[PDB]
Amino acid sequence: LAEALHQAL
Ligand SMILES: [Co+2]
């Protein structure tokens, strides 16, 4: 999740 969100943002 941490990096999924990092990509998204
Ligand atoms: Co990252």
Side-chain angles (χ1 to χ4, degrees):
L1 173 53
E3 286 284 66
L5 183 62
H6 202 201
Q7 176 67 15
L9 296 188

